[PDB]
Every structure is written in C-alpha cells, then in structure tokens.
Ligand binder design. Structure first.
Ligand SMILES: Cc1cc(-c2ccc(S(N)(=O)=O)s2)cnc1-c1cccc2ncccc12
Ligand SMILES: Cc1cc(-c2ccc(S(N)(=O)=O)s2)cnc1-c1cccc2ncccc12
Ligand SMILES: Cc1cc(-c2ccc(S(N)(=O)=O)s2)cnc1-c1cccc2ncccc12
Ligand SMILES: Cc1cc(-c2ccc(S(N)(=O)=O)s2)cnc1-c1cccc2ncccc12
Ligand SMILES: [Zn+2]
Ligand SMILES: [Zn+2]
Ligand SMILES: [Zn+2]
Ligand SMILES: [Zn+2]
Lengths: 260, 260, 260, 260
C-alpha cells in the first residue's frame, strides 16, 4: 500500500520500495543546465497505434490512476530494440491548483501528463518480465495544458464515470492513440530514469515530447473530479487528486534533446 | 547519518527520522494558486542584530552546511512571542547547476538560500527544548541570486577556506546581521512548516522575504567549491554541494503574503 | 588431495570433498538475466586495511595459490556482522591463454582475480570455526585485467621469486590493502556462495566489485610463471597455472547489484 | 541416476561415471586463444538425410532430453571413416534465462544446441559397440538463436506434447534433416572431445558449425516448457530445463577451424 498523500505518501515510499530511494529516479525538471543536444537522436515511428473501432480495450481504475490496456501489436520504432505497448495512464493535480504534470520544464508544471508504457519485445516475452530488467521499459510522456476541447482525449474521458472506484473496469472502442500525441513528435527530451510510482524500478527509457497538447477547462475539471482511490465501499473514501510525484534530484547527469 | 545524496538521501530520511514523512513539510514552491494577501501581517523589527564588533562568533562546518552561532540577545519583534536567534546557515547547488535555494518562486530556484534560526524564548528556556514543541521555532529565509558582490555576506564567506572540512571552526567578528537582509523586509511570505533537514520537526513559522539579495559569481563559486562533508584526512572526500531539499507537496493550505 | 588438472581435477573434487558437489557453489557468470538492482546494498567500509609499514606479514606458497596472512584487526564494516580478515590470495591462467579469473562477466574471463577472505568474528572465535558454519565467511573479489603497471599489486608480486615452491615463505612489509581495490567500490555484485576450492563450504557472502583493476603485461607474466605446485627438490616440477574453478550452475537464484 | 541439478548433478557425475572426471571432456568455450586454422579440413557431405516421408522415426523423452532415432543409412562423408547416424537431440535453458547451448563462442551462450550423433560404421557394427571405443563417434552441433519462426524445427517441436514425461514415445514421419543445418556448413570448428552426458566417453570427434540457425520466441518457449525429467508416476516431478553441461577446461590442446 502506497499513496500520494499522508503517512504512506512519497517521502515514505523507500520503506517498502527501496528503489524509490535509489538511482535514476524520475520525474525531473527539464532545464538548460542539464540539457544537451544529441544530433544522432532519430524520430520515433508509431506503428499499430490506429486501433480498430471494432475491437475494444480495457479501462481500469487501479487506485492510483486511470489505465487503458494496449495490445502488443502496437509498437515504437527508433530505439535499440522494438518496444511494444502495454498500457497508458494519466497524472493530474486538483481544482484549486490545476498543475499536476510529473515532469516540469524550466520549473513550470503543466496541467496533467499522459504516459504510454512499452516493454522490450525483442528481449522479453511480456511487460512483467521486462519491468525489473535492464532495457526493460520505454515510456512516452505527453505534457497537457489548458486550451481548446480535445475530441481525442474525450475518447478516454467520456468513460470515466464507469471507473469511479478502485477495481472498476470498462471497455473503450479502439481509436487512434496517435491523436493523443502533440505537434512535431520529432522534438523531444530523452534520459534514463525510473517508474514514477512504487516500485520505482530504474528500468525506463524516457521520451518527453517538447510540445504540449491541449484539453478544455471542462475536460480537465472532469478528470480531476471523476475518480476515487478507494473501493466501492472503503469506509474512508479518498478522491483521486494530486497523483503525481515531486521532481527528483538530477546531479552530474544528462538529458539529451533532439532539438537545438 | 543523513545526506543529500545516495542511500542516506532525502527519499530515505523518513526511515531514520519519521517526521520527514509527516505533515507540514518544508520547503515549498510559492506560486499564485496557494498565495493570499493578509493585510494584518505587520513588519518585523530586528533587535540586537548589530552585533558588537568587539565580540567574536563561532563559524562551523558541521558536514551538512556552514553555520554561524548567534547570541540570545538577538531577537525578532512583532510575532505572538519573542523569538531569540540561535544560528544561521546556508543552502546551495553546484557550479554545473547553480540553483540551490530551498524555496522556489513560481517554479524558479534561486542560486542559494540563507536561514536565520530563532526559538520561542518566551515559552521555552533554550532552542533545544523549543525545537520539537508547539510554536517552537521561527526561521527567516533570504533568497540569494548571482549578481553584485556583497560585502556583508563576505564577512562570512571570507572565512570559508578555513573551515573546508567537517568539524573545523573559525571566529567571525561581530557585524550587523541586518545587512544580510534584502530590501523592503516588510514584504514577505508567511506559512507554518518544518525544518528542511532531519529531524524535520513541523515546528517552524516561516518568513521568506519577497526580494532576493545578490552575491558575486566569485562568492557563489567559493561557497559551492570550498567545503567538504568529510573530515580532513578521509581517503575519499565528498564535496558539500546540492545541500538543499526538493520542494514538498502543499495541498489544502495557504501561504500568506504581506504584499499584494 | 586435489588439483586443477587431470584425474584429481575439479570434476573429481566431489569424490573427496562432499560440499564440492552440493548447493550454492561458486564461482558464477554475472550476466543480465540473473542480475537485480537492490538499493539496500550500501557501501562497505574497509577498516584497519592500512597495515603498519613497521610490521611484516607472511606470504606462503601452499601449492594451490600464493597467500598473504592478514591481521584480525582488519575488517569489513557495513554487513549485519563484523567480518575480520584472515588472508588474501589470487587465481590466474597461463601465458598461452591469460584469462584465469574465477567469476566471469557476460561470459568473459578477466586475466586474474584477487580474493580477500574474512570470517564472521561477531559469531565465531576464529576462521577455523567459522569456515563451515552459517554466515561464517565473507570474501571480496577484485577482477584483474591486463593493462597499466600497478605499484600496489607489486608490493606482493615483487616477492614471488622467493616463494617459487610449495611450502616456501617470505615476509611482506605492511601496506594499504585498500590500494588493491578498484574505483567506485560502492558498485558491486552480491550473492550467497561457497569457497571456490576444497572443501567448497557453502558459507560465503560474496562481494564482486563491478570495476576491474589493471596490472601490467610483465606483472601478469611473473604471476603466471614464477610459481610451482611442487616442492623444491622434486625432479618432476608442476607449474602453478590455471588455478581457477570453472563457473557453476546458477538457477532459481539472483545476484543483487548496487548499480543499475 | 544422474541429473543437471542438485546432488546428482554434474560435479558428482564422476562418482559413478569415472570418465566425466577424465581426459578430453566436452563442451568447451570456443575463443581465439585456442583456435587454429587448418586448411586441410574439408566440407562434410550429408547422405540419406532426406528421410522418407513413408517411414517413421521414434521420438523419445529419455529423462535428460528429447531424442529422435535415426537410421544408419544416414551418413557423413568427409571424415577419415564413414560415420552413420543413430540419433539427434537438444539442449536448452529456461524461460527466465533462455541461454542453454552447451558450446559457447567467445563466452556467449546461444539459446539452445542440436546434436546429431553418428557412429563409426567402417570400424564398428553398431552405435553401442562404437560408443566407448577409439574413433567411435562423430557429433554435429548446431547453435540455435532466437529469430524468425523455423518450420523445419517445428517438425520436431509439434510432437512435444506427446512425449511430456520420461519413457513416453511417439513416431515422427521422415523429413529432411539437412533442413536443421545452418548456412555455409563448410565453416566449422573441429576438436577431439567427449559425450557431454554420462558416461562421458572421450570418443567423440566434434564438428560445431560456425553459423547458428534461428527459431522463434514461441518455439523456444515451447521447447523449454513442454517436458519433464520424471515419469508419469513420479510424486516429485521435475521440469526439463537447463539440460546443458557447463564448459570444461581446455588446457594444452587445440580446436581447428575450417575458416581463417
Ligand atoms: C510494465 C509496468 C509498468 C508500471 C508503471 C508504473 C509507473 C509508470 S509511469 N508513472 O509511467 O512511470 S509505468 C507498473 N507495472 C507494470 C507491470 C505490468 C505487468 C506485470 C508486472 N509485474 C510486476 C511488476 C510490474 C508489472
Ligand atoms: C533549533 C535548531 C534548528 C536546527 C535546524 C535544522 C534545519 C533548519 S532549516 N534548514 O532552517 O530549516 S534549522 C538545527 N539545530 C537546532 C538546535 C540549536 C541549538 C541546540 C539544539 N539542541 C538539540 C537539537 C537542535 C538544536
Ligand atoms: C576460512 C578459510 C577459507 C579458505 C578459503 C579457500 C578458498 C577460498 S576462495 N577461493 O576465496 O573462495 S577462501 C581457506 N582457509 C581458511 C582458514 C583460515 C584459517 C584457519 C583455518 N583452519 C581450518 C580450515 C580453514 C582455515
Ligand atoms: C545412448 C547413447 C547416447 C549417446 C550420447 C550421449 C550424449 C551425447 S551428446 N550430448 O551428443 O554428447 S551422445 C551416444 N550413443 C548412445 C548409444 C546408442 C545406442 C546404443 C548404445 N548402447 C550403449 C551405450 C550407448 C549407446
Ligand atoms: Zn505515469
Ligand atoms: Zn536551512
Ligand atoms: Zn580464492
Ligand atoms: Zn548432446
């Protein structure tokens, strides 16, 4: 058991999850002093992201985020190995302070953040295996700010009232996950990091796109208010808000950019 | 044993010091969504801050920071109690990333941060018994930015190369401590928080001045490069750099401002 | 009554020493699939390793290796028990194939290997008693590759031409044993294993440092050609070469690393 | 009784099978220091390897491997004597660590290894007579790696669910065995060695082909998960995994290559 608030909150993760107090922890603040252009970074190519409408995909409240399962025939090209998709999920703040991205840029929090998790499907049979091993995972991160209505993000958010509580589940018809990504995917930040939640394994290769996406005022408030961390009858219900980790120390180490 | 790096670093403080994973932790990011103007916040008066030039004051490398002992006849006027000074010390980054303040403003790290530590002398007989009790401590924070040489700060910094190693001490002739304070001390952020180092006692009334002071690049580099956490003859020395805590979650609370 | 070649070689050790065909045998091949990061592995401290230069320490050819006796005031700090030093020795190949390390990394042999042997002095009165008992021993392993001359190793290797035959003894003045260790001793592999020689007791907590040291081409050749397994007057001399065990099966088990 | 794990495992083979602790043991690591080009080595020709589809060949789980019986009208030309076939079988690792070849190349384990066993039909009347006599046996070894699906190897793998336990047998229709061999069979390593299982007779002339073949992830996982070392009625079942011998010392001896 771990939470984002109170006694089992993130300063206490290291007790049961020692890696949370270990190496290569994420997320981080992306600022000029630790950036470095790498001319050899190539654009990712996104394959099998256009999910068939006649198929459906499981959405789950896992008590920490809302999660959509993704098929292993969905994959990224442009890394050392083929990585196949396993799931995506989100991180957000709260109505009084709607800044709940994990990564920050020059000290600025965005409204929210999308993570699309992949496992090394050349080396490893499944995400389970891959999660605590070298070269294990590749996570794509999209920064989300307030703006115009996003019909693509609403393909997820229109389902939130069916996964209000921990353990609940709902099917979503296939849509084009590539619509979730920003402008000019070629431009990104890349560094070696970790899971941002327990167990905090340092097995993730991070790609954070430079350019944010927009969702409406209304869409963001919906996401911040829809969900609970607790089961259909915990005596003490807890709202799912502020489900992001504080940025970590990042000392004598480098984040590589595909832009100058 | 605690540090700012490695297995004894801040994510693991909670394992030896339970308060570091509890409530009311410092430091924090000061941003609009959690600020509120409070016109009842009156100017502090700084009494006995003009230390006798004929007296000397102990400077010490304690392995975590550099610390100057302060006399009990030094005190803050204008709080519910009189608070008497006990010591001051600093926090800083590193030459490759010179942004090591503890508190941030709108996401932005300053170069360094000065802390003038006081205890409630009305209620308690010394800082020791005040430290972990209600209304025990008040800390004044000055944010420090790189720019102009600062003669007053140099009355401390000129002694740095003579306390390079843990346990070493020097004497500092009395000078006017009020000269370390920024302009318009009437303007400040106020909130209830904690020590930013173990034991992380949540017993601190924080006053962070609105306006930064400046020190020279040269002053900053001396601060960032002169000092070691280790004793003189340790075969493997460790540099005293990045001795600041990351900002903490601050939800469902307000910081009060004396300026609008 | 055992060798590293022919009928009394390692496939036959189990006929004379039951533990050599038992569980938890060393050495092993260190490869990604059986590695796991463990943030709980903190740095050892090497205490009393700076041996008095006014003292001398017995170096012996015992017919299997060259051995340096070590004082019991020398010890490892940072394990559950104190482990006190008893001897160090080496393992090597031969000039025709100079890859005689015991542990391998991703299949690759290094030139040679140093073992520094310690016993659990909290639990047990001497190394003799600890040798075949629970948590009895702890061995530090340094992988040795051929490269730059090493003055510290030469404090040993300079005496080799005076212990050429079995039973012969020389005195080595005290020097700093820490100088035999590599860079970044905080980085290591840890696993539960056995003596690599008869009687092969499965009582050893192994720490293999991640990073090798270098010794010169000339130092390596002296190690591989100076010593004999036989007594001086024996008309049939056998050269002390290839005195390393092959790697053992390692299944249903993990090696824990302090690095990722 | 002998096994690849625990107290009857490979370090104990010598107790009842003396030759396992003897001369000329296999397998070995093939690395530059012990290789020598030999221009007189000629290519093998493979005769009667295209087995009639109208005949049947017995597949058996023998408790140590899966074996396919072969006819003696299958032979190799290109050695000193005609060698005629008796069986083929395989060696493999386990799902967590899918590296179970017997021979290694520059320290690298491949996924698995195929052995095609032949006996000297010029000198001896049958494989049994030949097995423990001078010039008795010749074994071809093919190294196997993860890659594309291999429909030729599936002519074996598709019958595995019929031989899950020791003693169980199934007939396989003839296919072309030459389909199991890699590209450029003319390039190979040759050396004098032994059976890699008890009784470890030193009577094998080994040919290991330079180039590996590929099978899919699913085929390799199939092979590693299908079979048991124990009978139908064993109360203590054991999965058939890691059925490969560790590499042997190879001192004062040469492997000859057909390529330079
Ligand atoms: C692949 C995976 C990612 C995650 C993630 C946690 C946090 C992230 S995030 N915030 O993108 O860094 S991804 C959690 N669990 C698994 C996972 C998936 C499937 C089986 C697992 N078995 C053991 C441990 C973890 C397993
Ligand atoms: C009051 C006090 C605060 C602190 C502080 C640690 C960190 C801060 S900071 N970073 O301003 O929050 S203040 C350290 N020592 C004492 C202190 C001062 C004097 C005597 C003490 N005796 C026992 C324990 C602590 C004593
Ligand atoms: C504790 C010990 C380990 C060893 C070792 C044999 C092999 C290793 S190695 N290759 O590090 O695994 S360490 C040798 N001698 C002693 C030892 C040391 C001192 C007294 C002894 N008395 C009886 C038996 C052994 C004694
Ligand atoms: C059973 C057997 C195994 C082997 C082999 C055992 C291991 C290998 S391998 N792993 O290719 O080196 S080949 C060779 N010939 C025979 C053989 C085959 C047929 C009859 C026999 N009679 C007596 C002894 C051996 C006989
Ligand atoms: Zn995430
Ligand atoms: Zn402070
Ligand atoms: Zn040894
Ligand atoms: Zn075989």
């Amino acid at each position: 058991k771990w939470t984002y608030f109170g006694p089992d909150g993130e300063n206490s993760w290291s007790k049961k999850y020692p890696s949370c107090g270990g190496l290569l922890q994420s997320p981080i603040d992306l600022h000029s002093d630790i950036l470095q252009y790498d001319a050899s970074l190539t654009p990712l190519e996104f394959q099998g992201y256009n999910l068939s409408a006649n198929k459906q995909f499981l959405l789950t409240n896992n008590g920490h985020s809302v999660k959509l399962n993704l098929p292993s025939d969905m994959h990224i090209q442009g890394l050392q190995s083929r990585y196949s998709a396993t799931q995506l999920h989100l991180h957000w703040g709260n109505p009084n302070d709607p800044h709940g991205s994990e990564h920050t840029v020059s000290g600025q929090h965005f409204a929210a953040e999308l993570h699309i998790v992949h496992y090394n499907s050349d080396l490893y049979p499944d995400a389970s295996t891959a999660s605590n091993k070298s070269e294990g995972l590749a996570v794509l991160a999209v920064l989300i700010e307030m703006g115009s209505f996003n019909p693509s993000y609403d393909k997820i958010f229109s389902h939130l009232q069916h996964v209000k509580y921990k353990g609940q589940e709902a099917f979503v018809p296939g849509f084009n996950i590539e619509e979730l990504l920003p402008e000019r995917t070629a431009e990104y930040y890349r560094y070696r990091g970790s899971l941002t939640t327990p167990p905090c394994n340092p097995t993730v290769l991070w790609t954070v796109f430079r350019n944010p996406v927009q969702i409406s005022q209304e869409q963001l408030l919906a996401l911040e208010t829809a969900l609970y961390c607790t089961h259909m009858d915990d005596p003490s219900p807890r709202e799912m808000i502020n489900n992001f980790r504080q940025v970590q120390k990042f000392d004598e180490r480098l984040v590589y950019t595909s832009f100058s």
